[PDB]
Amino acid sequence: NVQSRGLDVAVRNANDGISIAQTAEGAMNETTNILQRMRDLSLQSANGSNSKSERVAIQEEITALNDELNRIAETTSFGGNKLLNGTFSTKSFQIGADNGEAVMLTLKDMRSDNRMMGGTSYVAAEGKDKDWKVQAGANDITFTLKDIDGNDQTITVNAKEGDDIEEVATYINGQTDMVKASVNEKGQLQIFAGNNKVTGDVAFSGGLAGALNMQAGTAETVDTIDVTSVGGAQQSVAVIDSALKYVDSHRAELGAFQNRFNHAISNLDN
Amino acid sequence: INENVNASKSRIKDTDFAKETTALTKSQILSQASSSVLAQAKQAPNAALSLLG
Amino acid sequence: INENVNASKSRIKDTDFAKETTALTKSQILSQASSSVLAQAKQAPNAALSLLG
Amino acid sequence: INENVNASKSRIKDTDFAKETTALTKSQILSQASSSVLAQAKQAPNAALSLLG
Amino acid sequence: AVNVNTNVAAMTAQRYLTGATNAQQTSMERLSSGFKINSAKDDAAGLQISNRL
Amino acid sequence: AVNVNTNVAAMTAQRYLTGATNAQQTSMERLSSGFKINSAKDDAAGLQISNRL
Structure with a gap:
C-alpha cells in the first residue's frame, strides 16, 4: 500500500519535472528565435552599402532584442520560481516510491551576458589594404588552443600565396571550425574562439601571424554586441553563432530530460 | 509559458x-x-427469538 | 544552396x-x-453485487 | 489612424x-x-428505503 | 477472483487511454504547426541540425 | 489524463492559428500595397536606406 501510493506521488513528481522542463524549453524557443533575428541583422549590418546611419538603425533593433533576451531570462518563471536567470541551479526531482531515487535537473543562465553565450576575440594590429597579398614563406598561421573537453590542438592553416586579406579570412573559416575569422573596416583579421568550442587563450605562430600581430583576447558575449562598425557586425555574427549553439545545447539537455522522465512515468505505471 | 503553465x-x-x-x-x-x-446483520439478534426468550 | 538547404x-x-x-x-x-x-471494466465489480453481498 | 484605432x-x-x-x-x-x-446524486436517499425503513 | 476494492482491468484500460491520448496530442500539435520537431523531446539531434539549416 | 477543465490541445491549435493569421495579414498587406517594407517593423534599416533612395 505504501509502495503503490508512493508510486502515485512518484508519477506526480515526474509530471511536475516534465512541466518545469517544458516551460523552460518553451522560453528557450523564443531565445533562439530572437538570436536568429539578431544574426540576420548582423549579416545585413556587415555590408559595405550600409552607411553609419543604417548601422545605427540596425544596432537599435539589436539593442532592443538584446534587452528582450534578458527579459525572457529574468522573468520566465514557473509559478514564481525563476528558471532561466541562473538562480534555479540544480534541483532533484524525486521519482520513486522510496527515498533516494531522484534525478538532478540543471537549468542554465540565458542572460545575454553569460560567458557561455559568447567567446574570446583577437584582432590583428596590422591593417592590410586591398593591395596586400599573402607572401611566400610568410603564409602559415598556427592556432595552439584547447578544446572544451580539454585536449590540446595545433591547427595549422597554410594560407595561399596571392590571397588578399578577405580571402585569408574565408580560407581560415573553411579549414577549421574551431575559430571564425573575419576582417573589419581597417583590414584587421579578427578571430573569434567561441567559449563553447575552446578554453583558455589562443596562441598564434607562423609567418602569417608574424605579419598580423594578433594582440590580446577580449571576452565577448551577446550583451556586448555592437554592429555599428563593419568589424563589430562581422564579429557579432560569430558571437551569435556561439550563443545559438549554447541555447540549442541546453534545449537538447532538456529534451533528453523530458524523454527520460516519460519513460520513468511508463515504468512507474506498470 | 501560458500553455505550459496551464498544463501544469x-x-x-x-x-x-x-x-x-x-x-x-x-x-x-x-x-x-x-x-x-x-440488512443481514440486523437479523443477527432476531435469532434470539428462536430461543423462546 | 538556398533551395537544397530548404529541402534538407x-x-x-x-x-x-x-x-x-x-x-x-x-x-x-x-x-x-x-x-x-x-466502461466495460468499471462494471466488473457489479458481479459481486449479484452475489447478494 | 483609423485602421490602427480599429485594430486596437x-x-x-x-x-x-x-x-x-x-x-x-x-x-x-x-x-x-x-x-x-x-441525477445519480438524487438516488442517494434511495438507499434509505433499502434499509427496511 | 471477484473483488470490489481494486480492479486491474480499469487501471490497464486507463494506462492505454492516456497513452493513446498523449499520442493524439502529439499528432495534433504536428498538424497545426506543420513541423514534426516542435521541441527537443521530438528529436534532439534533429532539432540542432534543423536549426543550423 | 481525460480532463474537461483545460484543453491544452485547443490552446496549442489557437496559438498556431493566430500565428498563421498574422502571416496571412502581413502577406495580404504586402500584396495590396506592393511594398514589402510598409513599416519599420518589417525592416528597420532597410526602411531608412529605401527612404533615402
Missing part, C-alpha cells in the same frame, strides 16, 4: 475523469455491499 | 501530413477502444 | 471566436457532467 495546473488541479469515474463506481458498489451486509 | 530542412523538420493524419486517426481509434473497454 | 478596438472589444467556441464547448460538457452527477 491541469496535472495538479484538474480531475482525471477516467480515474474518478472508476473511483465513483467502486465507492457505489461498496455502498451497496455495506447496505446488504447491514 | 524540410526532410528533417517539416511534418508529413500523409503520415501524421494516419497517426492521428490511429490514436483516435485507440482512444475510443480504450474508453469502451474502460 | 478589436483587440480590446471583439471576441476571439477560436477561444470563445472552445470556452462554450467546455461549458456544455461541464453542464452535462453536473447534470449527470446531479
Whole structure:
C-alpha cells in the first residue's frame, strides 16, 4: 500500500519535472528565435552599402532584442520560481516510491551576458589594404588552443600565396571550425574562439601571424554586441553563432530530460 | 509559458475523469455491499427469538 | 544552396501530413477502444453485487 | 489612424471566436457532467428505503 | 477472483487511454504547426541540425 | 489524463492559428500595397536606406 501510493506521488513528481522542463524549453524557443533575428541583422549590418546611419538603425533593433533576451531570462518563471536567470541551479526531482531515487535537473543562465553565450576575440594590429597579398614563406598561421573537453590542438592553416586579406579570412573559416575569422573596416583579421568550442587563450605562430600581430583576447558575449562598425557586425555574427549553439545545447539537455522522465512515468505505471 | 503553465495546473488541479469515474463506481458498489451486509446483520439478534426468550 | 538547404530542412523538420493524419486517426481509434473497454471494466465489480453481498 | 484605432478596438472589444467556441464547448460538457452527477446524486436517499425503513 | 476494492482491468484500460491520448496530442500539435520537431523531446539531434539549416 | 477543465490541445491549435493569421495579414498587406517594407517593423534599416533612395 505504501509502495503503490508512493508510486502515485512518484508519477506526480515526474509530471511536475516534465512541466518545469517544458516551460523552460518553451522560453528557450523564443531565445533562439530572437538570436536568429539578431544574426540576420548582423549579416545585413556587415555590408559595405550600409552607411553609419543604417548601422545605427540596425544596432537599435539589436539593442532592443538584446534587452528582450534578458527579459525572457529574468522573468520566465514557473509559478514564481525563476528558471532561466541562473538562480534555479540544480534541483532533484524525486521519482520513486522510496527515498533516494531522484534525478538532478540543471537549468542554465540565458542572460545575454553569460560567458557561455559568447567567446574570446583577437584582432590583428596590422591593417592590410586591398593591395596586400599573402607572401611566400610568410603564409602559415598556427592556432595552439584547447578544446572544451580539454585536449590540446595545433591547427595549422597554410594560407595561399596571392590571397588578399578577405580571402585569408574565408580560407581560415573553411579549414577549421574551431575559430571564425573575419576582417573589419581597417583590414584587421579578427578571430573569434567561441567559449563553447575552446578554453583558455589562443596562441598564434607562423609567418602569417608574424605579419598580423594578433594582440590580446577580449571576452565577448551577446550583451556586448555592437554592429555599428563593419568589424563589430562581422564579429557579432560569430558571437551569435556561439550563443545559438549554447541555447540549442541546453534545449537538447532538456529534451533528453523530458524523454527520460516519460519513460520513468511508463515504468512507474506498470 | 501560458500553455505550459496551464498544463501544469491541469496535472495538479484538474480531475482525471477516467480515474474518478472508476473511483465513483467502486465507492457505489461498496455502498451497496455495506447496505446488504447491514440488512443481514440486523437479523443477527432476531435469532434470539428462536430461543423462546 | 538556398533551395537544397530548404529541402534538407524540410526532410528533417517539416511534418508529413500523409503520415501524421494516419497517426492521428490511429490514436483516435485507440482512444475510443480504450474508453469502451474502460466502461466495460468499471462494471466488473457489479458481479459481486449479484452475489447478494 | 483609423485602421490602427480599429485594430486596437478589436483587440480590446471583439471576441476571439477560436477561444470563445472552445470556452462554450467546455461549458456544455461541464453542464452535462453536473447534470449527470446531479441525477445519480438524487438516488442517494434511495438507499434509505433499502434499509427496511 | 471477484473483488470490489481494486480492479486491474480499469487501471490497464486507463494506462492505454492516456497513452493513446498523449499520442493524439502529439499528432495534433504536428498538424497545426506543420513541423514534426516542435521541441527537443521530438528529436534532439534533429532539432540542432534543423536549426543550423 | 481525460480532463474537461483545460484543453491544452485547443490552446496549442489557437496559438498556431493566430500565428498563421498574422502571416496571412502581413502577406495580404504586402500584396495590396506592393511594398514589402510598409513599416519599420518589417525592416528597420532597410526602411531608412529605401527612404533615402
